[PDB]
Amino acid sequence: ETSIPEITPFNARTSSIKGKRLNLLVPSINQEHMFGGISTALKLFEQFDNAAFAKRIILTDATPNPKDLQSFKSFKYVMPEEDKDFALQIVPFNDRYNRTIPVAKHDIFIATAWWTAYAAQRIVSWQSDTYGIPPNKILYIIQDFEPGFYQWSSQYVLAESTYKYRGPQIAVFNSELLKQYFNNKGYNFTDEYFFQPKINTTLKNYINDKRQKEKIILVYGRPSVKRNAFTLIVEALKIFVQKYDRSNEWKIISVGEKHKDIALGKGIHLNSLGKLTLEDYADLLKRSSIGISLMISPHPSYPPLEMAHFGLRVITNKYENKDLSNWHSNIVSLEQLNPENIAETLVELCMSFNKESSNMMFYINEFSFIKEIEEKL
């Protein structure tokens, strides 16, 4: 590799549109990708007043198929080469070489993934030079410390450089933990907001159901998402199956992402259910007694919180300022993260099988800042 794909030029051209317009830069809107923070960004973008703002979604990585656009029926699907002034508009711009998109004088950009912010910050500079205006504010939806997605390398510093941008920029952090993490590292933004995690609305409908706990160890297994430390969990399970003589009493199930069943020893297997419907997931939560969900990141992630609120004893990990142990009594937070400790803790929890306290009420009781932000654009 001699070049860096993520930062392929994001060419713009002038447009005669005169109203204020919000532009959401997202990698994709396909259902296949409608998870992570792409759905959260779309939820937040939905909040902005379509009465005071035209809305255009710019796809930077993946083009949709007819099916995907069904979720955006009110949106006019338009090519980069056209320059329509619709109120709602979707433009595919993943294939950018020698092509450009019409950027208006008062186009405001909302970034998501770090490379979308990277591009936005360069479009803003082009914009102010072209139209002879002071730089407009960028809205930056920060889902995680994205440099952490890479080892120390080019991508790492490029991703981080988007946080060191000195132009007008408003950060909206996913979770307060993430915000405080950024504050500690000394990053600066024109303004800072955040939205706290909130229990999945479907799941909340089952949180009061009666629970018939079984001897089930529920694992959040996502081999493809390194932050979830799938391989570390497997290694821990293997030691657990070997050192714990009552392990045969337990079922060990994996949910989140489909993978092959994994032999742990003693004929015991890690059984993958892949990604269940929220309904089935809810049912499985009610029956399960122990949970394992790791998140190598200041962000808390959702499954640990969901598991705790369904009466599971949950094994999770500290990271810097994050320690979920004081969020909820059901949460067990390991500081030393290795297979042996997870196994050991797991044996303790199993033995204790023969809820209580919560300091995260906000979770079951969020974009109230949207309007305060609308006044700033």
Could you list the residues known to form a binding site for dTDP, using ranges: 36, 222, 275-276, 281, 306
227-239: burial string, b at 16+ Cβ within 10 Å, e else: bbbbebbbbbbbb
d(CA 199, CA 60): 30
Q: Which of 43, 14, 176, 184 minimizes the C-alpha distance to 112?
A: 43
Partner interacting with residue 200 (select from ligand TRH, a second copy, none; CB below 5-8 Å by kind): ligand TRH
**What are the residue ranges of helices labelled H in 165-226?**
176-185, 201-204
Partner interacting with residue 195 (select from ligand TRH, a second copy, none; CB below 5-8 Å by kind): none
Does 317 participate in binding a second copy (rule CB under 8 A)? yes
- Any idea how long the chain is? 377
CB atoms within 10 A of CB 209: 12
Does 169 participate in binding a second copy (rule CB under 8 A)? no
d(CA 303, CA 278): 12
| Interface segment toward a second copy; rule CB under 8 A; list 38-46, 98-106, 142-150, 351-359 | 142-150
Q: Per the annotation, where are the binding residues?
A: 36, 222, 275-276, 281, 306
Residues that bind ligand TRH (CB under 6 A): 35-36, 39-40, 43, 197-200, 220, 255-256, 275-276, 278, 281, 301-303, 306
* Residue (273 or 337) nearer to ligand TRH, CB: 273
Please provide residue 4's backbone torsions phi and psi, each rounded to the nearest 5 degrees.
-120, 105
DSSP state of 362: G
Residues 209-228 that bind a second copy (CB under 8 A): 223, 226-227
- Give the DSSP letter string of 80-95: TT-----SEEEEE-S-
> Residue 367 corresponds to which tokens in the numbers above?
């974009």
Partner interacting with residue 339 (select from ligand TRH, a second copy, none; CB below 5-8 Å by kind): a second copy
* Residue (31 or 39) nearer to ligand TRH, CB: 39
CB atoms within 10 A of CB 351: 10
**What are the residue ranges of helices labelled H in the chain?**
38-47, 114-130, 154-164, 176-185, 201-204, 230-243, 278-287, 303-308, 339-352, 370-374
Amino acid identity, position 273: L
* Candidate residues 297, 301, 316, 345; the one interacting with a second copy per rule CB under 8 A: 297
Partner interacting with residue 36 (select from a second copy, ligand TRH, none; CB below 5-8 Å by kind): ligand TRH
Does 339 participate in binding a second copy (rule CB under 8 A)? yes
* Residue (121 or 136) nearer to a second copy, CB: 121
Output the smallest distance, CB 90 to a second copy, in A: 29
Does 129 participate in binding a second copy (rule CB under 8 A)? no
Parallel/antiparallel/unpaired status of strands 138-142 and 251-256: unpaired
Task: State the burial class of residue 350 (Cβ atoms within 10 Å of its Cβ: 0-12, 13-18, 19+).
Answer: buried
Helix (H, G, I), strand (E, B) or coil at 160: helix
| Interface segment toward a second copy; rule CB under 8 A; list 33-41, 161-169, 198-206, 323-331 | 161-169
* Candidate residues 98, 152, 208, 210; the one interacting with a second copy per rule CB under 8 A: 152
Does 201 participate in binding a second copy (rule CB under 8 A)? no
Does 188 participate in binding a second copy (rule CB under 8 A)? no
Partner interacting with residue 302 (select from ligand TRH, a second copy, none; CB below 5-8 Å by kind): ligand TRH
Output the smallest distance, CB 318 to a second copy, in A: 10
Q: Which neighbouring-strand residues pair with 101?
A: 12
Residue in the block written with tokens 């980069």:
80
| Interface segment toward a second copy; rule CB under 8 A; list 11-19, 22-30, 126-134, 332-340 | 332-340
Binding residues for a second copy, per CB under 8 A? Answer: 1-4, 7, 148-154, 156-158, 160-161, 164, 166, 223, 226-227, 229-232, 234-235, 259-260, 262, 296-297, 317, 335-339
